[PDB]
Ligand SMILES: CCCCCCCCOCCOCCOCCOCCO
Ligand SMILES: CCCCCCCCOCCOCCOCCOCCO
Ligand SMILES: CCCCCCCCOCCOCCOCCOCCO
């Protein structure tokens with residue numbers, strides 16, 4: 302069996318108190334009568350702690366033991382009337398009294414009439430002192446601290462008066478270390494000026510800033526209140542000038558896969574970045590290079606020049622694609638990153654048996670947004686991506702083009718860890734010469750991340766002879782439910798719908814449904830799905846994939 306039963310009866314009923322007592326007492330285990338009898342004093346003790354945490358200081362607690370199958374330790378309890386706050390005086394004086402973002406202790410638990418809960422008082426005090434320390438009120442002193450309780454007549458008074466005194470400020474920022482990065486650049490990624498009101502989260506922001514620039518392998522950003530201005534000392538350890546990286550992966554879409562990167566994290570004092578990268582899979586190989594120049598602000602604004610070469614043999618198309626490009630990234634405080642681009646490309650291609658070659662110089666604008674709990678175990682978050690590019694034939698273009706692609710990903714956790722995943726992707730290309738439009742600019746659907754139940758890029762318009770050539774438009778959507786089965790183990794069920802097509806009037810949407818297993822393994826998030834195609838002649842398909850959900 303064999304677990305012994307614990308029964309808590311409160312008169313009158315009080316579900317809160319009951320559940321609390323049940324959690325505090327814990328599990329009885331597989332204890333027999335004698336063993337339950339030894340356990341009684343612990344049981345009553347725990348029960349009265351549990352009562353005290355909810356404000357009941359006059360709870361009558363008694364315990365019965367009854368042998369049986371299984372044995373039963375019954376707790377009977379008369380709550381009595383609890384302790385309620387009468388007077389509550391929480392005051393923050395000094396400069397902090399006028400500071401906008403200084404949270405005062407608030408809420409139901411501190412309203413007069415509320416049952417006094419364990420540690421709401423200490424919570425209030427901790428909050429006040431934590432914000433005091435965050436905002437540099439280091440001379441902040443509690444002038445009054447009083448929690449007063451009379452269990453008889455059930456009254457409690459809280460008195461917290463906090464004289465905050467003057468607010469400290471940021472002193473000068475100093476930089477030392479074997480970094481060749483000019484201080485001109487380093488100072489433009491300091492999220493505060495000197496003589497500006499102190500904020501420890503700005504120190505943190507500085508820390509993460511320096512860390513994310515890629516320029517160093519270690520940063521020491523420290524400045525304990527000292528010396529009213531706090532000087533800030535930053536020491537920087539220059540990163541290794543060059544770096545190599547290798548990755549292995551697998552997919553149902555493309556199979557075994559190898560990634561390589563060769564990065565140069567600082568080329569010069571002005572913070573330029575160099576890079577090389579490649580990936581090899583049986584159906585697709587590509588190589589790319591890039592150069593980056595920080596603008597202002599250095600971290601959210603930059604120029605990125607790129608080049609690339611890519612071979613692809615997939616389904617019924619082949620393509621050798623060459624590309625050069627200039628990009629201008631800027632990100633607003635939302636998290637909205639805009640990318641203004643000018644890209645030139647040349648594509649050698651075979652659609653079915655028809656060989657084409659066309660080239661385009663195209664401008665584009667993109668918007669991105671990523672908001673998550675993060676970062677490997679996101680419990681909720683979302684990704685938004687919008688991208689439009691276009692070309693004018695004559696102006697270094699073999700055809701006219703208006704290419705649009707958009708994606709939205711979303712994840713939510715609700716209840717006891719049940720997840721819901723939502724996915725939408727849309728694409729469209731307008732042109733006056735579809736035959737001149739190469740594969741990379743056409744749209745395809747189906748696959749692990751597209752419409753499961755269907756092989757990668759197989760959902761597509763076909764020509765006279767039955768070859769999948771690419772759509773003028775596409776949609777792909779999915780809804781997935783995940784059930785937590787263990788730590789690192791989830792059980793999913795999903796529905797995907799989508800297609801690539803040439804006519805808005807005949808989308809011919811295909812549907813896949815199925816279920817799979819998710820595992821946060823020692824090599825990354827693994828997903829294994831079994832999917833049934835409902836449309837065309839649908840059999841079954843095994844999908845496998847790795848990488849973050851978002
Ligand atoms: C999650 C582990 C990461 C895997 C890294 C690379 C492993 C490469 O997997 C090899 C898989 O080979 C078995 C399937 O390959 C057959 C594909 O079709 C062969 C053509 O007949
Ligand atoms: C845009 C957010 C709402 C869209 C959800 C439903 C999408 C409707 O199906 C789209 C299929 O057509 C593809 C074209 O969509 C993008 C615009 O086309 C650009 C061509 O000018
Ligand atoms: C993802 C965007 C939403 C698209 C909505 C339009 C859906 C159009 O097709 C719906 C067809 O019905 C779904 C199932 O069809 C398969 C037929 O056989 C099912 C037997 O179980």
Ligand SMILES: CCCCCCCCOCCOCCOCCOCCO
Nearest residue numbers: 716717718719780781782784794795796
């Ligand atoms: C994409 C559509 C998915 C909808 C089908 C779901 C079918 C599976 O049913 C799951 C029922 O689970 C009930 C949840 O209760 C479990 C609670 O225990 C764990 C959390 O405490």
